[PDB]
Design a binder for this molecule. Structure first.
Ligand SMILES: [Mg+2]
Ligand SMILES: [Mg+2]
Ligand SMILES: [Mg+2]
Ligand SMILES: [Mg+2]
Ligand SMILES: [Mg+2]
Ligand SMILES: [Mg+2]
Ligand SMILES: [Mg+2]
Ligand SMILES: [Mg+2]
Ligand SMILES: [Mg+2]
Ligand SMILES: [Mg+2]
Ligand SMILES: [Mg+2]
Lengths: 139, 211, 192, 117, 176, 43, 97
RNA sequence: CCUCCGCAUAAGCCUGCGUCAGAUCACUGACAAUUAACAGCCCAAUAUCUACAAUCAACCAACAAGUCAUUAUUACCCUCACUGUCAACCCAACAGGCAUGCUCAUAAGGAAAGGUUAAAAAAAGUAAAAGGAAACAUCACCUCUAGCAUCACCAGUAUUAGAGGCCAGCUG
RNA sequence: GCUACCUAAGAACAGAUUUAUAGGUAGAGGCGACAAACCUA
RNA sequence: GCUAAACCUAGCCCCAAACCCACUCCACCUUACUACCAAACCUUAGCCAAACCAUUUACAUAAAGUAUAGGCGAUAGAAAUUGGGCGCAAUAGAUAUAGUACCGCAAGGGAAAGAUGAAAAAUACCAAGCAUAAUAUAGCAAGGACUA
């Protein structure tokens, strides 16, 4: 869990166990070309590599084999109207290599107007032969 | 741009995510996108019942008299440019189509006596009554300019006008207002214009030719 | 939303609002009078009657209540006319848009008399508070299906009292139910 | 030369960047030769149940009624949890009923906590 | 598997998904602790689903199908976590009588102000903790002047706010 | 004008919160920044 | 051009307000209510200038000794500097002596 | 055609010529990236050991005298986490500066000329008849002070320490 | 964080050298192969 | 006719009254914002006035500027006793839209600015400066004038 005080372990003590997990996770699409067995996540900052291994093993039954993380610096270079820097938040990225010869490809997610569109078909733009004269009149 | 697809594709290429938000108020329209049944000119007592069950004091034998006064008085509101009466007299599908191109020029329409009696032709039908009327009148026009020089029509001389005017009523406080004006495909061309027109050909970039 | 944000006909976070109220404007705030929450008596859907301006006397229906400016949008009344859908070379369409109304300019309507009546909040034996008119003791009531998807609990399973109130932790109860048995005893640390 | 920016781990010389980290928790400790020993017991085990046959979906149908918020005070939890056992054993040593004076012998101590969340 | 990060493959691109209500608290106070454990993991996996769907929604430059059910799932995780904390707190009041799960003490730092100090776990006792004894939980007498200065800055801000509220009230009585 | 020749060790060791709190005069520096209202009391 | 183009909103002045219609009442509470109160006990204001008129140096001296112990810290400091300035001004500077 | 530049690490900076879009001698918004083996981040006590420079270390050759080490007993069995990783970049100037390793003209990096004319004056470069200038410190020395030990002098002891003084030739 | 001297542990090409890094000395002061120089224009 | 102009209302000031604040979770004196190992008090000085300076030099009412002190000079000076707005209204009023931007190694210094309407789900005329409209012998550029 995150934003929780962990209890201190003394040598010979019990197993540290988390029962309700605080931190979420989201698997993003890779922005570059990556191997077929690598799944890229956005871990939250406090989640270690080992927590991510047991997180996907326990909750999702994913056979995880390697995990490699990079912390991404979001830019502090964009300002308000007040000339005050906005920070896009930093985030950790997990790169997960799945075991047993399995392979993940990111799926193809995302594969009254009658009145408007039925007057956009009855537009009847002005004739050039009419020379600017309004054609409402029956004369 | 030219349509909504161009703006949404440009907003997707740019990154403008416009979330479609849920609002309890919508647009309370009082008109129709065009005509219910296109009366093509040379048994609809169903819709007369479907009008009298809402209105219940409605004589068709008096209505083309009323349709005359809805017509003529609305056209006199062009002689003064009185738009606030036109919104009582004309629908909102009909208001721009008669007042937009006439802006920044003076018109001097006038009515003189009808050749025929005006007579109702058909009647059709949250509920929109729609009554097409045949009028065979004699009218006078003079459309001037910003500069006050005549660009359409002799002012004295009356001309004989056929008018298949479609009226519409909302079916609480509304009334019969001019909705459209059918012009038949057999109709003769209108008055010619006092000026001459050049109509351009294809503007050729150097890589293409005229053929 | 910033301080002295100006409310308007648009909702407070839409695209048209962010065109109208960008985060750097500062305008003269509208002096609205204080109407308490107990004392607001126009609800979405009430048939009302307009007292001032155009469409005076006409009886419409409240569609939106913009409560921060003491506003009532009587749907179909107090209309001006705006175009919509205006492209580069099409003039759009003429549409009857509605300008709002202050709550002073609007009175409610008896459903048996159809008259502009003052409304006082009397109390009742059946309901603690409800509106009652003045020209008659008449209760004007507050005005105004579903199939479950694959990821909704039905009302049966959502309301089963499966909770036996005990003196155990969620942690201890899950340790018992999951069959986890912990032999190592916890060793006392210092807190300071 | 910045003061407004947050002092993060990306920012110092090598000796600074190695020490400061993100909010991650220590799992083991360093030993000689800079060899990290990982302790199995400090790593959290996600105790995750079996979801088979489980009838609670993430949303509630709209047909369910509205109820009133009654937060669980200790008077309520004493009443339903303890009060029938005291009414039964009074019509016919408080540790009998689910009370513990100390909890230094206890695994999940309530003050101060040793469980997580 | 990883297909639990994605919803039903029939819903892909439908731009509107019928979702039910959120869990309110009183619906969840009827559920046992084992059942709130399991519902925590149901909502947990659903929340990871919706967060992948947001980030792919920003990636493809498209709007979300229905962003409301993310608000509902955060709503339910908040209500469920609040219920579980209520039962931990009521059991803590019965078994020990404390109110904070974590110990602390009202202390008074170098800067003179009174702060709730949250205790940390340590192994060695405090008197031979070398880093704990470099912290000063006492204010020397050169601080009490700044305490008076801070006191008066807060009293100025409060007086300005109260007076300004009365001026707005006078403008309301002149206008109405 | 290249008088500022930067390093982070000299910046934190010169002007950081720990050196500011190490002396009574530096604690008064912090208290005056806290009373002027500033966003950065130190490096 | 620092002059306004539209003439301002009108100044509605109610001469028969509560305050204006009852202005001046109990100014003669001494001389025709048996001298039980003085009219200076009718004025409301700062506690150091209820029924006292002085120039600025005297208002500052009297403010310091009558309320100065519970003045704010930098207001008391500004006021001691004002008495120190106004002392050095009235006593050492001027035309007539 | 230049290349006295480059490429990496260090320090610094902190997303700052990635893609999509748009406004603007001719930055804004969205999205994506930097993946640890390199480098940081180390070490169980208590005692006790550590006379023989480096220089191809061999002779030689020295003085200014030097950069590198354990053992005894006790305790000790888990293991690969965390952080850095991008760029056309930093400090200045509105010229300059910058540690180190390699490459020593480059396999790497770049462009002195917006277009024209070919005035003066100015700057720089090349050519030019005949002539060919038309005080302190301090070795050394002297003087004075100082017989002494755990924060300088000094882990030194009067051979010490401190303070003083001293023509021919060429050339715009 | 310049600059002056110093210290620690370095480096480079021949030293009364040059230099990177971190530390020390602070204004009645410091520091000075003493220019009554320099000590963030 | 461009540039611009205008605009009231954010807020503020002075009183009165009243004695204020401060643990969602986490982190925060180590290089603050970092889960976890062997000691506090010690006369203010001076500026300035004395036309220099050197002792000296202010920090309810009434007695009373009295007694006193004092290079008996500048000056200082008791006691007994007595008993909401004839505010500001965007160069103002707060520095404040913010202790932010920016500047500084740091202590520290410290900005500027907004104005539609009931609804935006309705998109005039006036500063200097120019432009319309360059110039005509001669001269503090005007005055007397003059048909000009
Ligand atoms: Mg890494
Ligand atoms: Mg390594
Ligand atoms: Mg690199
Ligand atoms: Mg190249
Ligand atoms: Mg050129
Ligand atoms: Mg020559
Ligand atoms: Mg003097
Ligand atoms: Mg007295
Ligand atoms: Mg101001
Ligand atoms: Mg200001
Ligand atoms: Mg002008």
């Amino acid at each position: 869990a995150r934003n929780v005080v962990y209890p201190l372990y003394r040598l010979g003590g019990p197993q540290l166990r988390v029962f309700r997990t605080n931190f979420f996770i989201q698997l993003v699409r890779p922005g570059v070309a990556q191997p077929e067995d690598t799944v890229q996540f956005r871990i939250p900052m406090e989640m270690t590599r080992v927590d991510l291994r047991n997180y996907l093993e326990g909750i999702y039954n994913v056979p995880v084999a390697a995990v490699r993380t990079r912390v991404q610096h979001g830019s502090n270079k964009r300002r308000d109207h007040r000339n005050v820097r906005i920070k896009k938040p930093d985030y950790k990225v997990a790169y997960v290599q799945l075991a047993h010869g399995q392979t993940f490809t990111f799926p193809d997610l995302f594969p009254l107007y009658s009145m408007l569109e039925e007057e956009r078909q009855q537009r009847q733009s002005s004739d050039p032969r009419r020379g600017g004269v309004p054609s409402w009149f029956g004369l | 741009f030219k349509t909504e697809k161009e703006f949404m594709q440009h907003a997707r290429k740019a990154g403008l995510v416009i979330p479609p938000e849920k609002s309890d108020r919508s647009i309370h329209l009082a008109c129709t996108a065009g005509i219910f049944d296109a009366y093509v000119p040379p048994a609809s007592q169903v819709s007369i019942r479907r009008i009298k069950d809402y209105d219940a004091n409605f004589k068709i034998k008096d209505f083309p008299e009323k349709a005359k006064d809805i017509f003529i008085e609305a056209h006199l509101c062009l002689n003064n440019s009185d738009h606030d009466r036109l919104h009582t007299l004309v629908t909102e599908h009909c208001f721009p189509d008669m007042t937009w191109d006439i802006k920044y020029k003076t018109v001097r329409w006038s009515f003189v006596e009808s050749l025929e009696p005006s007579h109702v032709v058909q009647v059709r039908c949250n509920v929109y009554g729609q009554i097409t009327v045949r009028m065979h009148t004699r009218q006078t026009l003079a459309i001037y300019d910003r500069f006050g020089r005549l660009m359409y029509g002799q002012e004295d001389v009356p001309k004989d006008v056929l008018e298949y005017v479609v009226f519409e009523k909302q079916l609480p406080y509304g009334s019969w207002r001019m909705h459209t004006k059918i012009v038949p495909p057999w109709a003769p061309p209108k008055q010619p214009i006092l000026k001459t027109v050049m109509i351009p050909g294809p503007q050729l970039k150097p890589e293409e030719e005229y053929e | 939303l910033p301080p002295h944000y100006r409310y308007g006909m648009s909702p407070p976070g839409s695209v048209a609002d962010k065109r109208k109220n960008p985060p750097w404007i500062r305008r003269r705030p509208v002096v609205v009078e204080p109407i308490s929450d107990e004392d607001w008596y126009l609800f979405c859907g009430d048939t009302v009657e307009i007292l001032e301006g155009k469409d005076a006397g006409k009886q419409g229906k409240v569609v939106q209540v913009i409560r921060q400016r003491n506003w009532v949008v009587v749907g179909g009344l107090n209309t001006h006319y705006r175009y919509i859908g205006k492209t580069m070379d099409y003039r759009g369409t003429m549409i009857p848009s509605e300008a709002p109304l202050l709550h002073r300019q609007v009175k409610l309507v008896d459903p048996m008399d159809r008259k502009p009546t003052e409304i006082e909040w009397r109390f009742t034996e059946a309901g603690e508070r409800v509106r009652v008119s003045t020209r008659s003791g008449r209760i004007i009531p507050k005005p105004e299906t579903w199939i479950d998807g694959p990821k909704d609990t039905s009302v049966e399973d959502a309301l089963e009292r499966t909770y036996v109130p005990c003196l155990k932790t969620l942690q201890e109860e899950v340790m018992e139910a999951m069959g986890i048995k912990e032999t190592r005893k916890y060793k006392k640390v210092y807190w300071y | 030369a910045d003061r407004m920016s947050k002092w993060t781990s990306k920012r110092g010389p090598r000796s600074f960047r190695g020490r400061k980290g993100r909010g991650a928790k220590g799992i083991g400790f360093l030993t000689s030769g800079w060899r990290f020993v990982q302790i199995k017991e400090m790593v959290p085990e996600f105790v995750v149940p079996d979801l088979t046959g489980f009838k609670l979906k993430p949303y509630v149908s709209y047909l369910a009624p509205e109820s009133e918020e009654t937060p669980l005070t200790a008077a309520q939890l004493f009443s339903e949890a303890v009060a029938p056992a005291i009414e039964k054993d009074f019509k016919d040593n408080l540790e009998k009923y689910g009370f513990e004076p100390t909890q230094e012998g206890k695994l999940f101590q309530l003050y101060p906590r040793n469980f997580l969340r | 598997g990883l297909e639990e990060f994605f919803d039903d493959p029939k819903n892909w691109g439908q731009e509107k998904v019928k979702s039910g209500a959120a869990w309110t608290c009183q619906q969840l106070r009827n559920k046992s602790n084992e059942d709130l454990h399991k519902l925590w993991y149901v909502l947990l996996k659903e929340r990871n689903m919706l967060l992948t769907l947001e980030q792919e929604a920003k990636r493809q430059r498209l709007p979300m199908p229905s962003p409301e059910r993310l608000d509902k799932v955060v709503d339910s995780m908040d209500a469920l976590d609040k219920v579980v904390q209520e039962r931990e707190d009521a059991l803590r009041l019965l078994q020990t009588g404390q109110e904070r799960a974590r110990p602390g003490a009202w202390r008074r730092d170098i800067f003179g102000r009174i702060i709730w100090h949250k205790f940390k776990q340590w192994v060695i006792p405090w008197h031979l903790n070398k880093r704990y004894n470099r912290k000063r939980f006492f204010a020397l007498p050169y601080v009490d002047h700044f305490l008076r200065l801070e006191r008066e800055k807060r009293a100025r801000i409060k007086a300005r706010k109260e007076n300004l509220e009365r001026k707005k009230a006078k403008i309301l009585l002149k206008k109405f | 004008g290249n008088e500022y020749q930067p390093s982070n060790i000299k910046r934190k060791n010169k002007h950081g919160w720990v050196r500011r709190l190490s002396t009574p005069a530096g604690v008064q520096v912090i208290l005056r920044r806290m009373l002027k209202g500033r966003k950065s009391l130190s490096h | 051009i620092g002059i306004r183009l539209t003439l301002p909103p009108p100044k509605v002045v109610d001469r028969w307000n509560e305050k204006r219609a009852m202005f001046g009442v109990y100014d003669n509470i001494g001389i025709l209510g048996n001298f039980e109160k003085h009219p200076k006990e009718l004025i409301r204001g700062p506690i150091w200038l209820r029924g006292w008129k002085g120039n600025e140096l005297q208002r500052c001296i009297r403010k310091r000794k009558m309320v100065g112990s519970r003045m704010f810290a930098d207001d008391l400091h500004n006021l001691n500097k004002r008495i120190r300035y106004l002392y050095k001004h009235f006593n050492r500077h001027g035309k007539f002596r």
